[PDB]
């Protein structure tokens, strides 16, 4: 496999994409996209929001999941039906039928935006996968291994592609390289990536 434990489902969300994007716009009308500030003081080039009971955010110079959007002081918007259903279909196809995400981080990449190499280790049970849905412009996803200096591999993620990051791949260092500018008929000029997470304690 390209990444042990990962299940790549190319175009899995292609048919759902128009509805997914409508729902991104609805979520963002309530909890707007914002460029968060990292613990080191840098404003991220990616802009994010969340839906579900919990949302991933900066708070007090750390990362955590919160039931309240610090920008609005209101709950994050509820998980849209289209999100819930797509995630469950993908996770079930990939062999995680009990995956029940309570958070969905919505990440908007403008041209030039990137995500530096990192791990997602803020979740309480790292045996639960993360389901990652790409929409719009294509991006190069890089990933290594469990160690920061493991050799990097790269793959293009295109509109509609879903990856279920389970098993070992759940813990790999990964990132997204600077987004090339272009046109997409449904997102116009950007990429969105949805990452579904089980963030609450059992
Ligand atoms: O776009 C894709 O294809 C994949 N997207 C992600 O892997 C993704 N991951 C996030 N995770 C973070 C965890 C820690 C962190 N840090 O410590 O600085 C920065 C980020 C946050 C948003 C994401 O869209
Ligand atoms: Mn990540």
Numbering used by the authors: 14 to 215
Paper text:
The fat mass and obesity associated protein (FTO) is an Fe(II) and 2-oxoglutarate (2OG)-dependent oxygenase that catalyzes the oxidation of N-methyl groups in nucleic acids, and, in particular, of N6-methyladenosine (m6A) in RNA.1−3 FTO is a potential medicinal chemistry target due to its roles in obesity and cancer. Here, we report the use of structural knowledge of how FTO binds 2OG and substrate to design potent and, at least partially selective, FTO inhibitors. Using information from crystal structures of FTO in complex with 2OG and substrate mimics, we designed and synthesized two series of FTO inhibitors, which were characterized by turnover and binding assays, and by X-ray crystallography with FTO and the related bacterial enzyme AlkB. A potent inhibitor employing binding interactions spanning the FTO 2OG and substrate binding sites was identified.
To investigate the generality of the skewed binding mode of 14a as observed with FTO, we solved a crystal structure of a truncated version of the related bacterial NAOX AlkB (AlkBΔN11) in complex with it. By contrast with the crystallographically observed FTO binding mode of 14a, in the AlkB-14a structure, the metal-coordinating atoms of 14a and the metal-ion are co-planar with the pyridinyl ring. Contrary to the binding mode observed with FTO, the p-nitrophenyl group of 14a is directed way from the center of the AlkB active site without significantly displacing key substrate binding side chains. In the case of the structure of the complex of FTOΔ31-14a, a skewed inhibitor binding mode was observed; the skewed binding was less apparent in a structure of the bacterial NAOX AlkBΔN11 in complex with 14a. In contrast, the superimposition of the FTOΔ31-14a and AlkB-14a structures with the PHD2-2 structure reveals that the nitrophenyl group of 14a will likely project into an unoccupied space at the active site entrance of PHD2.
